[PDB]
């Protein structure tokens, strides 16, 4: 599905900006925003994931509960990037935007979060 | 294909492989098929008797019937919006036993190999480390990838 997606390798600040600013949770089948770590601890019920730094831990360093944290959250809905996109219709190597960025995806997401 | 008979478009399909001709072998007769077993219907011309239809040639399903020279086998055929289960009946040369569950009976018997070394003894084969970790590279040979001029003259 490469013509439809732009992927890459996140940093620690890309994870914690996405979890804090635009990270929400699937609580009672509803999309509620992370406001306190009590609401995270009430969601996962794992005694290893009790705060918002537990979720950026399991995401950034995979851990035993990468799936339960990411299936815990709603899909992140970002803004379009400020400053634009170069070409949607071509790969990143061809001079456009889709495909893999071997850690360059951080500056592209830093214009969206 | 201008005709809709039973063997139509089966020119290359019901043929035999090059220097693989002949009547079926004795290890096909001795291979005993049991009800409830996954078999693998592959139509064997040089028998020409009790062949499956051309649809059931790569297919593999469960035996439900064993008669003296016949095997019934339940094979899924998707029709419009549903996958109904066709119970065909072939001669016994047109089935092979299926090795589909070979990799599952292998890690099942590895789970009685383990649990027979944990509860009683202690001797285990070690767990395998991933090759995707970050090691150091000791270069025993280096080249230069450079696209020489003489690479074009061919």
């Amino acid at each position: 599905v490469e013509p439809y997606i732009a992927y890459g390798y996140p940093s620690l600040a890309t994870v914690r900006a996405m979890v804090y600013k635009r990270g929400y949770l699937k609580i009672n089948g509803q999309r509620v925003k992370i406001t306190d770590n009590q609401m995270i601890k009430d969601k996962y019920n794992n005694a290893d994931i009790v705060c918002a730094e537990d979720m950026v831990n399991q995401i950034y360093t995979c851990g035993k509960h990468f799936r339960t944290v990411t299936h815990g959250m709603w899909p992140f809905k970002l803004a379009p990037p400020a400053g634009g996109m170069r070409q949607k219709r071509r790969h990143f190597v061809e001079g456009g935007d889709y495909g893999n960025r071997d850690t360059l995806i951080n500056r592209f997401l830093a214009r969206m979060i | 294909v201008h005709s809709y008979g039973y063997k139509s478009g089966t020119r290359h399909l019901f043929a035999k492989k090059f220097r693989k001709h002949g009547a079926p072998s004795v290890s096909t007769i001795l291979t005993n098929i049991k009800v409830g077993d996954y078999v693998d219907v592959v139509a064997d011309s040089a028998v020409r008797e009790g062949m499956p239809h051309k649809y059931y040639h790569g297919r593999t399903g469960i035996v439900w019937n064993v008669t003296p020279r016949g095997v019934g086998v339940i094979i899924n055929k998707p029709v419009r919006t549903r996958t109904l289960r066709k119970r065909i009946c072939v001669r016994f040369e047109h089935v092979r036993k299926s090795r589909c569950q070979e990799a599952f009976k292998a890690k099942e018997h590895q789970f009685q190999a383990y649990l027979a070394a944990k509860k009683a003894g202690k001797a285990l084969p070690p767990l395998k480390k991933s090759s995707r970790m970050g090691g150091i590279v000791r270069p025993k040979n280096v080249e230069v990838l450079a696209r020489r001029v003489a690479d074009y003259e061919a």
């Binding site: - | 439900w64 019937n65 008669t67 019934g72 998707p78 419009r80 919006t81 549903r82 996958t83 289960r85």
Partner: protein
């Protein structure tokens, strides 16, 4: 006059709206009618013993309740 003969265009998109309904499991509708008959008549002899064993086991489970 002449029209369009045969097409398979929309059909695969029509077939997946209510899904391709998958096959059903092997414990549903596993009728042995039409199977090889000497082994079918044998298995009836056995099920008529397994039913009267089930009538006797449940009756024996009641006397192990009225005494305890």
């Amino acid at each position: 006059a002449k029209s369009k003969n045969h097409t398979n265009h929309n059909q695969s998109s029509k077939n997946h709206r209510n899904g391709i309904k998958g096959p059903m499991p092997l414990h549903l509708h596993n009728s042995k009618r039409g199977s090889w008959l000497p082994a079918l008549v044998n298995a009836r002899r056995v099920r008529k013993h397994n039913q009267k064993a089930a009538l006797k086991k449940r009756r024996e489970r009641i006397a192990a309740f009225a005494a305890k």
